[PDB]
């Protein structure tokens, strides 16, 4: 419950930041560019923290089993239950990665290791380039 509690508080503050950026964008007059950058960076790094913390506690979330309350009436709130129950993605993202995979399209494994060696080589090359010139 502790992990889900931390997820709750962090997601609540993320939703609060979203409500903020919403009600300062809803104005008919656009504020200064710099305030928009500050709000963007803060909210976006907060989203990063959301992702990282959700990553950290996957085991606690998975272990939990969902069950409706005995006191909760489904006869009158079945629509509300179904609203939270549904999880299928929005369609546009679906065909989005479908076209993405269409465009992308032992052989695969050796290309994978070739990518490994290119990555390592590029990292070493840029380390050497940084070391070549004194930046301090």
């Amino acid at each position: 419950g502790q992990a889900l509690d931390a997820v709750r508080m962090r997601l609540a503050q993320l939703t609060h930041s979203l409500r903020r950026i919403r009600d300062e964008m809803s104005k008919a007059e656009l504020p200064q560019w710099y305030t928009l950058q500050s709000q963007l960076n803060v909210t976006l790094s907060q989203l990063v923290s959301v992702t990282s913390t959700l990553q950290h506690f996957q085991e606690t979330l998975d272990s939990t089993v969902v069950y409706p309350l005995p006191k909760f009436p489904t006869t009158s709130h079945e629509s509300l239950v179904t609203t939270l129950l549904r999880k299928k993605n929005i369609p546009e993202v679906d065909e989005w990665m479908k076209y993405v995979r269409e465009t992308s399209g032992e052989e695969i494994e050796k290309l994978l290791q070739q990518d490994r060696e290119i990555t390592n080589w590029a990292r070493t090359t840029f380390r050497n380039e940084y070391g070549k010139h004194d930046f301090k």
């Binding site: 290309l111 070739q114 990518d115 290119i118 590029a122 090359t125 840029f126 380039e129 940084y130 070549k132 010139h133």
Partner: protein, 108 residues
Amino acid sequence: MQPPYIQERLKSLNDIETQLCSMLQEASQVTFIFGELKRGNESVKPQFENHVKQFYERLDKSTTQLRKEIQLLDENVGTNKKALGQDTEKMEEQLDLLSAILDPSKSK
């Protein structure tokens, strides 16, 4: 016109921003080339080293030259005034006009 010193100062500054533009352009080409390098054709691999080296050497010496300019600012300290003579020069030209008026052989 301005004294020459300001002229080469502004030339050096213009060179500075042109070098910055060249650095941005070379960043564009290196970002371009890395894409196909990730794609998997090794022909343009040698060009990558040259592009990276030229990009870094363009980034460094530009900042170095700008640092030299800001340093020049440090020792350049200590190194209507025209109005004080302005009326005088006006005076001069007016009398010149009188001369042109005074001589009828020069009014042609």
